[PDB]
Amino acid sequence: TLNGGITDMLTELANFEKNVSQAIHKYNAYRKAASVIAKYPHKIKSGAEAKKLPGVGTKIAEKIDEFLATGKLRKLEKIRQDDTSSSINFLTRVSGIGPSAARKFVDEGIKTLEDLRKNEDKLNHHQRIGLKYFGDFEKRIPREEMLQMQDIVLNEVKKVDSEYIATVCGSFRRGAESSGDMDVLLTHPSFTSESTKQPKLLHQVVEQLQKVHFITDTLSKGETKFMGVCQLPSKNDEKEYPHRRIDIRLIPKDQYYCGVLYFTGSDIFNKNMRAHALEKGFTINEYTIRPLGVTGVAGEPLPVDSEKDIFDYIQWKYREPKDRSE
DNA sequence: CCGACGTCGCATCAGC
DNA sequence: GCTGATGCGA
DNA sequence: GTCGG
Ligand SMILES: Nc1ncnc2c1ncn2[C@H]1C[C@H](O)[C@@H](COP(=O)(O)CP(=O)(O)OP(=O)(O)O)O1
Ligand SMILES: [Cl-]
Ligand SMILES: [Cl-]
Ligand SMILES: [Cl-]
Ligand SMILES: [Cl-]
Ligand SMILES: [Mg+2]
Ligand SMILES: [Mg+2]
Ligand code: NA
Ligand code: NA
């Protein structure tokens, strides 16, 4: 937080462009600038100094000058005033509610936490759960609780089958002292890019996690992805821990490295790494890295034996998880 | 200029 | 039932 | 909103 004020302004501007203007390009632009400015080792002194950083053009440079001189931004001040803007922005904070659904509700007269409760009937399952744990999902998870959560997951997974390998990724693997949620990468030798020797692989795990009452709710569930809710167990007379979001991703074992790279993120890092990949003639996803033909066509998977192999193909120095928090 | 700016799983809808 | 677009999220 | 060709 050397330039915490500036990166917050741009983040607010990004959230506004995405939730209200439904303009993700302006969204990505602001996110990028906030990112590049967040890793800047100096205390920005002007818009011009910031403009030297890639991603900060003229418009943002001007906005930075204003912020520095007054400690605020009029454009955002007005946005905070506007009731529709603030209402939409607010509703998008409910898990499962996006710009579209937010603007729809405000068009129907639903614009507060109270309005959502007395209209639960208009929400799909996901939105209902996001509302039910609204306060809870707004809280950060101390690493200490992440560790206890890690332990429960790995151990409950081992009990279903010793061959399952569960790895906690996301901001946790990047070393954050706190996380917004828990992300779990799962692998089993019975599921490779060549065949699915077993069914209900993710199910069995989710099932066991529910059995021990760790997983409390489900937001969505397929054969390789599970998005839900979990809660650490508490002591006698001890207050309950908040419910937490939990994501599970089953990836073909032979595609592990590509999978853990993806799931470690951050999201912006992935976008940048993948963008850079395309310029170097490759395309990367959570399964593989394939070379692109002159006609823009995904070639066949390339051999990968480590995360570092992916960075090499694109000619990037390897970067430790703790340095991929862009 | 001014067009390009990662990738994909699941829930839901419309159309058939 | 299906496919395919869209919303929302990882 | 910013960038490179
Ligand atoms: N838009 C996107 N494009 C590409 N990859 C994306 C992505 N959103 C999420 N990911 C990937 C990388 C995240 O680390 C990882 C976890 O997704 P996540 O939403 O849990 C965010 P995380 O980075 O874990 O921080 P935190 O706020 O949860 O503590 O999923
Ligand atoms: Cl846009
Ligand atoms: Cl402001
Ligand atoms: Cl891989
Ligand atoms: Cl692939
Ligand atoms: Mg996370
Ligand atoms: Mg997550
Ligand atoms: Na710049
Ligand atoms: Na939301």
Answer yes or no: do A159 and A257 share one domain.
yes
Answer yes or no: do A48 and A98 share one domain.
no
Nearest protein Cα to ligand 1, atom 21: A170
Residue A258 neighbours by CB under 8 Å, 6+ apart? A284, A285, A286, A287, A288, A289, A304, A310
User: Where on strand D do bases come within 7 A of a protein Cβ?
Assistant: 1-4
Please say whether the beta carbons of A321 and A286 come within 8 A: no
Answer yes or no: do A180 and A196 share one domain.
yes
Which amino acid does the sequence have at A151?
A: D
**A127: nearest nucleotide, CA–C1' criterion:** C8
Q: Within 10 Å of residue A85's Cβ, how many Cβ atoms? A: 17
CA A246 from chain center: how many Å? 11
Task: List the determination method.
Answer: X-ray
Answer yes or no: do A165 and A191 share one domain.
yes
Strand D lies under 7 A from the Cβ of residue A26: yes
Using the 8-state DSSP alphabet, how is residue A112 labeled?
Answer: S
Task: Look up A104 and say whether it is catalytic.
Answer: no
CA(A122)–C1'(B14) in Å?
A: 19
**Nearest alpha-carbon partner for A224 in A195, A191, A257:** A191
Strand D lies under 7 A from the Cβ of residue A29: yes
- Regarding the beta carbon of A180 and ligand 1, being less than 6 Å apart is answered yes
Closest ligand to A47 CA?
A: 8
Residue A236 neighbours by CB under 8 Å, 6+ apart? none
CA(A281)–C1'(B8) in Å?
A: 20
Nearest protein Cα to ligand 1, atom 24: A170
What's the N-to-C CA distance of chain A in angstroms? 14
Answer yes or no: do A213 and A150 share one domain.
yes
Which amino acid does the sequence have at A109?
A: G
Answer yes or no: do A70 and A92 share one domain.
no
**In this structure, which long-range contacts are made by residues A158-163, counting pairs with CB atoms below 8 Å and at least 24 apart in sequence?**
A159/A208, A160/A204, A160/A205, A160/A208, A161/A188, A161/A204, A163/A188, A163/A189, A163/A190
Name the active-site residue from A63, A104, A221, A253.
A63
Q: Could you tell me the distance, in angstroms and rounded to a whole number, from the CA of residue A275 to the centre of ligand 8?
A: 18
* Domain CATH code at residue A126: 1.10.150.20
Domain of residue A267, residue span: 263-325
- Resolution of the model in angstroms: 2.3
Provide the domain count of chain A: 4
- Regarding the beta carbon of A181 and ligand 1, being less than 6 Å apart is answered yes
**Smallest Cα–C1' distance to nucleotide B8: which residue has it?**
A285
Answer yes or no: do A295 and A236 share one domain.
no
Exposed, middle or buried by CB within 10 Å (0-12, 13-18, 19+), for A191?
buried
